[PDB]
C-alpha cells in the first residue's frame, strides 16, 4: 500500500497568477502512473492529467504538469474564476489506488457589497403551525458577513440556521440565507422583525425590517 | 544427495502487470549443438517454495530430451509436490536452442507441510541440464518481488460478444502471431491509434497493450510499436505493426478505409487450450473523432512443431587447408577475459554416430590430454585463445563442431569446414 | 459519446442492502475497466474497486476487508456494486468512472465520470419534504423546502428556466435530525407582474 500527502491545501490566491500545487509520494512511483484531477462543487471529477505530464484532450493549457520521482505538481498558471474546483492527485498502477487530500483553490474579488432581501413566512406555512423568516445576501465575496435576527429590538441566538454557497465560477462571489425559525403563537405575539447585516465594503450595518400584517 | 553445477548461469525474472494465471521462464543458456540426432540431455528442475515463511523443495524430472523428436516435454517424475504435480509443468523448446518452463499458478503444486495455507510463494527456479559431454549446465531464476498462488478463481465464464472473424491465430513456441485485416473510418494523419489483447482459456488471462501509448502520428504504411502483454517478459519482446493500404490526405465521410493489423505478444502459454479465445479491441480517437471502438475475436489454436531448428546459433567457417596439417583458431568467449577460474572448450565431429566414441574431446586451463580423442591436438595457448589442430585429412570434407565456455559467460558455438 | 448513466438516490438501513446499476453506452462495454470511486463528506476520494466485463476480474480495496461485491452482465452494458455489510461509516457517493484507455488489469486513469449516486445511511425514517413560497416585495423572489431528512434534493425553477439567476443553498442540519434548503432566483423587478415564475422541486412530490 501507498500513501499519497498533498501539501497546499488551500490557495487563495488573485484572479490570474500562477498556482502551484504540489503531491509527494512516499514510495518511488513510476513516473508515468500518477494522475491530476478537478472536482467542481456539486459536480464529479474530471480528469487533468494523465501521464503525471500528459495533458487530457481538451484541458486547456494553463494547466501544466510537472513531477518525478516522488515530488510531483501542477501548475495552474493563469487563474480565473472558473477554477474554483478542488484539485486530487491520483496513483494508479497498484493494487490499492491512492488518492489526494485535495487542495481547495479560491479566486480573489474585489469586496463587493451583499444586497439583503428579508421574506415573512408564507401563510401556507403558518398553517402548519411553524413560521420561518428568511433573509438573503445575494452576492458578496468577503464571505464574512453576519446576519444578526431582531425581534422587537431583541437579539435572536440560537433560534435561526445560516447556509452559505460556495464561490460560484463566474463572478466569485458568495450568497448567504439566515432563516429564523418561531413558533406559531410566537410569530403571532411579535410585532416587527428585522434582519441585520454587517459586512466589509458597506461602512454600516444594513438592516431589512418589516412589521406583521403589511 | 543432489547433483553439483559446472558453470552456473543464473537469470533475475521479473513479472510485469500481474500474474495471468501461468509461469514461464525462457532459458537460452543450455547448449544444442547442431548436426548431432545422437545429442541427449537429461534435465531434472528444483524448484524452492515459501509456504508460510518456512521454506520448501520441488524435485521434478523431465529425463532424455530428444531434440529432432519431440517439442513439448510433460515431467514424468515429482518428489517434493502433491497429488499429481506433472500436469501442472511443461518444459516447451522454442527455436535457436532456448527451453521455457512453464507451471501454472492458479492450482497448488506442492502440499507436505500444512494444508490449508494459501501464501505459496515461489522464490526461484533451478535448472539442471545434462551435457553430451557430461557437463552440468545449472540456471538460476530468482524472483525479484516473489509472488503468490491464488488457485482456482472459477475462470470458465467465455462469453462471446465480439466481432467475429473466420481467421485463426497460431501460436509456434510459445510466439503467437496474427494478421488481422480492420477498417477505420478516419485518415492516417488524424488517426491516434490503440489496440489491446486478451488471451482466455481454462485459467489463463493475459492482457497486451502497446507501451507507447496511442499512435502519435499513423504515418503511411508500416506502422510500428512495442506492446507489453502481462504475465513474465521475455527477450526479443512482444510487437505489431498497423500497416495501412490508404492513400488518405483528405478523408471523406462515410468511407472506411482499410487498415492491416498485425500482432506478435511473445509470451503465450499453451495453458490457454485449443479452440481458445483472443479478443482485440482497436480504437482510434483524436479530439473525440471518428474512429470508434471495435472489437475483432478469433480462436487461438498452438503449432505442436518447432517453428525453428533447435540448433543454437553458429557461426560457419571455411579452411581452405592442404596436405593433412590442418589448423584454426577459437577466439576468446563473449563474456570472459584473463580472470576466469574455470574455461571449457569442446570439440566433436559433425553428425556423430556413437556417444561413447566421438564425445572425447573436452580441453580445461588445467589439462589438455584427452582421454579418447584421436588425430585432434587440443593446445589452449597464450593470449587466452584456444588453437585446434587436426592431422589424418585428406579429399573428405570433414567438419569440426567447436564450442566454447567460461564461468560468466554466454556458451558459444563454431562450425568448422575443412575442405580441399 | 461515453455515458455512464448512474441510477439510484438510497437512503438505506444500518444492515447493508444496496444496489447501483451505472448504465454504459458509447463504447466496446467489454474492453474498458470501470472503476468506482467513493467520496464522503470528510474531505477525501477513495477507490472502492474495479472490475473488467470482458473476463469477470474484480478487484477491490483493502481498508473495506471484503465488503463489496462488484459484478457485471454484458447483455446489458452494466456494472452492478454491492457494498452490503454492517455499514457504520458508509454514507458517501459511490462515482461510476471509465479508464482513459485500455490498460493492464485495472492501471488505467479514469477519464470519463459518471453522474455519481449518493447513499446515506441511517436509522432514522424518510421524511418527506415542505415547501412554501418567498414572495418577493427589492428584486428577488424565492422557494424554501425544509424538513425533509433524504439529503438528495433537487430544486427547479420555471421548468428549466432561469438559469443565470438561481441560487440554491446547502443543507443545515437542525437540531430535530433533518435537513432545510432554499432557492432563490433574481428578477429584474419590472416583469414580475408579467411573468410567472413557478418553483417546482422534486423529491418525493411535485408542487407549484
Ligand atoms: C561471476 O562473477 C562474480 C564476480 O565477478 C562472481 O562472484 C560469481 O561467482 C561469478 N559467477 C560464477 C558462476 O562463478
Ligand atoms: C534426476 O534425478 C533422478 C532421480 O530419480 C536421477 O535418477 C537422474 O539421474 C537425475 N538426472 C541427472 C542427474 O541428470
Ligand atoms: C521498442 O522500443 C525500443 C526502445 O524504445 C526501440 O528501440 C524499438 O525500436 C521498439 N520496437 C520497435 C519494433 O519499434
Ligand atoms: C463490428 O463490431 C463493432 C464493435 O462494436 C460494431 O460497432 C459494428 O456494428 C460491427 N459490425 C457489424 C457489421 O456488425
Ligand atoms: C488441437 O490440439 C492438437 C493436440 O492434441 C493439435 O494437434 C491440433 O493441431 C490442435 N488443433 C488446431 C486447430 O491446431
Ligand atoms: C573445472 O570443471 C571441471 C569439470 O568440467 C572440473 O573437473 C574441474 O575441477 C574444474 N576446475 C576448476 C578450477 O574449477
Ligand atoms: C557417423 O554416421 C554418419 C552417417 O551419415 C557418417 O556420415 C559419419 O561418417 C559417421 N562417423 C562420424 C565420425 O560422424
Ligand atoms: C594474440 O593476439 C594477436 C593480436 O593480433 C593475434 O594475432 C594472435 O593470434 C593471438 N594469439 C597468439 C598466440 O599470439
Known amino acids: 500500500e501507498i ?212 | 544427495a543432489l547433483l553439483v553445477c559446472q558453470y552456473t548461469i ?229 510487437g505489431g505493426i498497423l500497416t495501412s493500404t490508404s492513400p488518405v490526405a483528405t478523408p471523406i465521410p462515410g468511407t472506411g478505409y482499410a487498415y492491416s493489423l498485425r500482432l506478435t505478444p511473445r509470451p503465450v502459454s499453451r495453458f490457454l487450450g485449443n479452440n481458445s479465445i483472443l479478443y482485440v479491441f482497436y480504437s482510434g480517437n483524436g479530439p473525440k473523432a471518428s474512429g470508434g471502438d471495435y472489437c475483432i475475436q478469433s480462436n487461438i489454436v498452438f503449432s505442436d512443431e518447432i517453428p525453428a531448428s533447435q540448433d543454437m546459433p553458429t557461426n560457419t567457417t571455411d579452411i581452405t587447408y592442404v596436405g593433412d596439417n590442418a589448423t584454426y583458431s577459437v577466439p576468446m568467449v563473449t563474456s570472459e577475459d584473463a580472470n576466469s577460474p574455470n574455461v571449457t572448450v569442446t570439440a566433436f565431429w559433425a553428425w556423430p554416430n556413437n556417444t561413447e566414441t566421438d564425445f572425447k574431446c573436452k580441453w580445461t586451463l588445467t589439462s589438455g590430454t584427452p582421454s579418447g580423442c584421436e588425430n585432434i591436438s587440443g593446445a589452449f595457448a597464450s593470449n587466452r585463445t584456444f588453437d585446434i589442430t587436426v592431422s589424418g585429412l585428406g579429399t573428405a570434407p570433414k567438419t569440426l563442431i567447436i564450442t566454447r565456455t567460461a564461468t560468466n559467460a554466454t556458451t558459444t558455438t563454431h562450425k568448422v569446414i575443412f575442405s580441399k | 459519446q461515453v455515458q455512464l448513466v448512474q441510477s439510484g438516490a438510497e437512503l438505506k438501513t444500518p444492515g447493508a442492502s444496496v444496489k447501483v446499476s451505472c448504465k454504459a453506452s458509447g463504447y466496446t462495454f467489454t474492453g474498458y475497466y470501470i472503476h468506482w470511486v467513493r467520496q464522503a463528506p470528510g474531505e477525501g476520494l477513495e477507490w472502492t474497486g474495479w472490475i473488467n466485463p470482458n473476463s469477470g476480474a474484480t478487484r477491490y480495496g483493502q481498508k473495506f476487508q471484503g465488503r463489496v461485491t462488484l459484478t457485471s452482465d454484458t447483455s446489458s452494458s452494466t456494472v452492478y456494486m454491492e457494498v452490503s455489510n454492517l455499514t457504520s461509516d458508509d454514507s458517501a457517493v459511490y462515482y461510476c468512472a471509465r479508464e482513459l484507455s485500455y490498460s493492464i488489469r485495472g492501471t488505467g486513469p479514469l477519464g470519463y465520470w459518471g453522474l455519481g449516486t449518493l447513499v446515506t445511511v441511517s436509522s432514522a425514517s424518510t421524511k418527506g419534504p415542505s415547501v412554501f413560497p418567498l414572495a418577493p416585495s427589492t428584486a428577488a423572489l424565492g422557494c424554501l423546502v425544509k424538513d425533509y431528512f433524504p439529503e438528495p434534493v433537487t430544486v427547479s425553477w420555471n421548468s428549466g428556466a432561469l438559469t443565470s439567476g438561481v441560487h440554491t443553498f446547502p443543507a443545515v442540519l437542525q437540531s430535530s435530525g433533518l435537513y432545510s434548503l432554499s432557492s432563490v432566483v433574481t428578477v429584474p423587478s419590472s416583469s414580475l407582474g408579467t411573468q410567472t415564475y413557478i418553483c417546482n422541486v422534486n423529491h418525493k412530490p411535485s408542487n407549484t
Not at chain 1, 501548475?75 to 491520483?90: G, M, N, W
Not at chain 2, 494444508?115 to 535448472?127: A, F, W
Not at chain 2, 480492420?182 to 497486451?208: H, R, W, Y
Open chain 2, 10 to 238: 543464473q537469470s533475475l525474472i521479473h513479472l510485469t502487470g500481474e500474474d495471468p494465471g501461468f509461469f514461464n521462464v525462457e532459458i537460452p543458456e543450455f547448449p544444442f549443438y547442431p548436426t548431432c540426432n545422437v545429442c541427449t540431455a537429461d534435465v531434472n528442475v528444483t524448484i524452492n517454495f515459501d509456504v508460510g515463511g518456512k521454506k520448501h523443495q520441488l524435485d521434478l524430472d523431465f529425463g532424455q530430451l530428444t531434440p529432432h523428436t519431440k517439442a513439448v516435454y510433460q515431467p514424468r517424475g515429482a518428489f517434493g509436490g502433491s497429488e499429481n504435480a506433472t500436469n501442472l509443468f511443461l518444459l516447451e523448446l522454442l527455436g535457436a536452442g532456448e527451453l521455457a518452463l512453464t507451471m501454472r499458478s492458479k492450482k497448488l503444486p506442492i502440499n507436505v507441510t500444512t494444508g490449508e495455507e494459501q501464501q505459496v510463494s515461489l522464490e526461484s527456479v533451478d535448472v539442471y541440464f545434462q551435457d553430451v559431454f557430461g557437463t552440468m549446465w545449472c540456471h538460476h531464476a530468482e524472483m525479484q518481488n516473489p509472488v503468490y498462488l491464488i488457485p482456482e478463481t472459477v475462470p470458465y465464464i467465455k462469453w462471446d460478444n465480439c466481432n467475429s472473424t473466420n481467421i485463426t491465430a497460431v501460436v509456434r513456441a510459445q510466439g503467437l502471431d496474427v494478421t488481422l485485416p480492420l477498417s477505420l473510418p478516419t485518415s492516417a494523419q488524424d488517426s491516434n491509434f490503440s489496440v489491446k489483447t486478451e488471451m482466455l482459456g481454462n485459467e489463463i488471462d493475459i492482457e497486451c497493450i502497446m507501451e507507447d501509448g496511442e499512435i502519435s502520428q499513423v504515418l503511411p504504411g508500416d506502422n510500428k510499436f512495442n506492446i507489453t502483454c502481462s504475465g513474465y517478459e521475455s527477450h526479443v519482446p512482444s
Open chain 1, 3 to 214: 500513501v499519497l500527502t498533498q501539501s497546499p491545501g488551500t490557495l487563495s490566491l488573485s484572479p490570474g497568477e500562477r498556482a502551484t500545487l504540489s503531491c509527494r509520494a512516499s514510495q518511488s512511483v513510476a513516473s508515468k502512473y500518477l494522475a491530476w484531477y478537478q472536482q467542481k462543487p456539486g459536480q464529479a471529477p474530471r480528469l487533468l492529467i494523465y501521464g503525471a505530464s500528459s495533458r487530457a484532450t481538451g484541458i486547456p493549457d494553463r494547466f501544466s504538469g510537472s513531477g518525478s520521482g516522488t515530488d510531483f505538481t501542477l501548475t495552474i498558471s493563469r487563474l480565473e474564476p472558473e477554477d474554483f474546483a478542488v484539485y486530487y492527485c491520483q496513483y494508479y498502477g497498484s493494487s490499492p489506488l491512492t488518492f489526494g487530500q485535495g487542495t481547495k483553490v479560491e479566486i480573489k474579488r474585489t469586496v463587493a457589497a451583499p444586497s439583503v432581501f428579508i421574506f415573512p413566512p408564507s401563510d401556507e406555512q403558518l398553517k402548519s403551525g411553524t413560521a420561518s423568516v428568511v433573509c438573503l445576501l445575494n452576492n458578496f465575496y468577503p464571505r464574512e458577513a453576519k446576519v444578526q435576527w431582531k425581534v422587537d429590538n431583541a437579539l435572536q441566538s440560537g433560534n435561526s440556521q445560516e447556509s452559505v454557497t460556495e464561490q460560484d465560477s463566474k463572478d466569485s462571489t458568495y450568497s448567504l440565507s439566515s432563516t429564523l425559525t418561531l413558533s406559531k403563537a410566537d410569530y403571532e405575539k411579535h410585532k416587527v422583525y428585522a434582519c441585520e447585516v454587517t459586512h466589509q465594503g458597506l461602512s454600516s450595518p444594513v438592516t431589512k425590517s418589516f412589521n406583521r400584517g403589511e
